[PDB]
Ligand code: NA
């Protein structure tokens with residue numbers, strides 16, 4: 034196919050062994066209780082006891098449970114009353130919370146320097162099988178912003194002095210979509226002649242959601258986000274389809290893409306850097322707003338691909354970003370989807386939690402590695418805005 | 430021309446009256462002196478007078494001078510009408526309070542980053558209402574460019590929602606620093622070419638909105654020399670412009686800058702010479718005195734290549750080109766000019782924009798391009814060059830039509 038871009042070769046890197054959810058919940062609950070006691074001058078044991086019981090009750094009620102998420106990769110959760118060891122200065126940098134003295138923990142500068150170090154290493158592992166520089170490298174993240182970025186430093190470390198680096202930043206849980214949109218555009222811009230020809234764009238996701246741990250705030254939506262979000266680093270490539278074929282690779286051919294905002298929703302999800310970490314609010318209104326608009330969005334997306342929702346939806350897999358425990362279910366229900374059309378997305382959430390932008394790429398990795406050639410996949414995700422983003426893919 | 434994207438309709442928006450360089454120098458030196466005394470719990474009078482003479486000498490030696498920058502828009506600097514002379518500063522009007530982020534009476538770190546981001550959201554949300562007040566039809570894409578405030582949802586996404594623009598794709602082009610317009614334009618170009626590929630329906634217009642509020646990052650608590658330079662070099666700039674497929678631009682009968690080529694990559698061994706990282710209180714900068722030499726040493730090969738990408742030849746055609754060069758510091762344009770064997774007239778607008786406005790981060794190149802579109806003879810080709818953290822060199826070749 035001329036004028037075609039193809040996703041391929043998806044490579045996750047695990048930086049830390051995933052922690053069983055019931056343990057994340059016990060310790061996070063204990064940390065929120067100590068922080069709270071530090072924050073309100075409660076100093077006596079029986080004081081901590083009553084606060085701890087209340088925090089635990091709150092966790093039982095509102096925390097994402099082990100039945101919903103089995104384990105999460107959390108680089109900044111301590112390595113396996115609790116007592117926490119100090120770590121080797123060998124790595125004070127993994128320790129960004131504080132339950133003895135200042136409950137706000139590390140400040141943002143410290144967290145940013147930590148991010149650069151951890152992602153730096155992650156990126157060197159993500160790209161160690163890469164033999165030739167890409168024409169472009171896109172860095173996607175919503176969890177740490179530095180200039181130059183860890184991506185820029187790695188490209189230089191590799192001596193990749195003809196590679197364009199583009200930051201695709203602050204586009205949250207759906208950040209794969211705009212990154213794939215750029216990549217498609219960089220291949221199309223090359224075919225238009227504005228740059229010499231290009232044969233590969235590499236996109237690298239690095240989300241350290243656990244770097245933004247906030248145990249000083251006890252509002253429900255913070256309990257929920259502390260127990261919901263997880264870390265994920267994953268890279269994949271975008272090839273012009275002729276280059277994909279020449280290299281004998283399997284891939285996901287891009288058919289169509291779409292993205293725009295949803296009305297009366299801007300305040301329902303926010304994410305803002307403050308003095309110590311990026312701070313989140315999340316309204317319980319969000320799944321209903323997604324439910325309300327997803328169908329019309331999906332019908333339009335399939336039309337963009339020359340498809341018809343009523344006639345073609347049954348043969349499609351739907352890769353859906355699992356933003357909360359019930360998001361896939363809601364979309365499943367609104368779109369009238371069978372279990373086997375949404376099974377991979379539920380399972381990635383169940384095994385990993387919400388790794389923010391890195392989630393959808395892990396979903397697409399499983400489709401690329403499991404589906405028959407010819408399979409079509411409609412991808413949907415949501416993030417702040419609120420934004421709806423979508424992609425139509427075909428396995429080739 | 431098919432497969433052709435063209436820049437047009439450059440629209441700056443001034444939010445505050447620019448302040449003459451000399452007064453920014455004197456008040457800023459005064460702030461640095463007070464902040465130093467506060468950090469150090471120096472409450473002694475003569476203690477302050479000595480700190481202050483010292484601070485002023487460092488300003489005399491290192492600050493960007495009124496001969497280099499005449500005035501700057503600094504939304505987060507007090508209005509002259511508020512300056513009373515030591516100086517004091519009048520309390521702001523109530524609905525202007527979010528414009529005071531520095532503190533020289535109690536805690537010299539000033540407002541924390543969250544307060545700064547909230548102030549930024551408001552000031553940019555008003556700036557964007559002005560920038561888009563004459564927009565008649567929603568664009569297909571809106572690209573928000575900044576390296577100076579990051580919120581989700583952004584002020585750009587909120588504006589797009591307030592307008593009811595629910596078909597418009599919003600993309601954030603963030604944290605690409607002073608050369609920010611170059612990745613923005615590359616992205617606009619890809620979107621049109623992606624539409625032409627058939628991956629979205631046809632599009633007719635991408636809008637790019639730069640909102641750089643560098644003054645929101647005032648740091649008067651560090652007196653290291655490179656921060657004296659930064660606090661007196663950088664300035665604020667809000668500007669939008671549009672990218673059209675050429676056939677659309679012709680039907681509207683607009684003049685524009687047709688894009689011929691573009692490039693961007695990193696320069697070796699220079700990652701630590703210019704850095705920009707959010708911390709507790711603001712985004713913190715560092716800047717190495719080596720930056721101008723590193724740029725000069727690489728800019729010729731880059732420029733030769735860029736011209737090659739446009740089907741031209743540096744050595745044969747440079748005399749016919751204008752060179753829009755991001756003025757990152759007082760001497761950047763001069764160093765590049767010298768390295769490239771350029772005449773004064775080929776680089777005058779980049780120099781003039783610097784002198785009149787300071788370094789407006791990513792907004793600076795778009796103001797230089799607005800002047801070219803207004804003044805250039807049809808057929809004139811412009812080589813554009815921008816640098817920023819990486820270090821990164823970014824390139825564009827344009828033709829006025
Ligand atoms: Na870049």
Ligand code: NA
Pocket residue numbers: 204211292420598599600601
């Ligand atoms: Na967006």
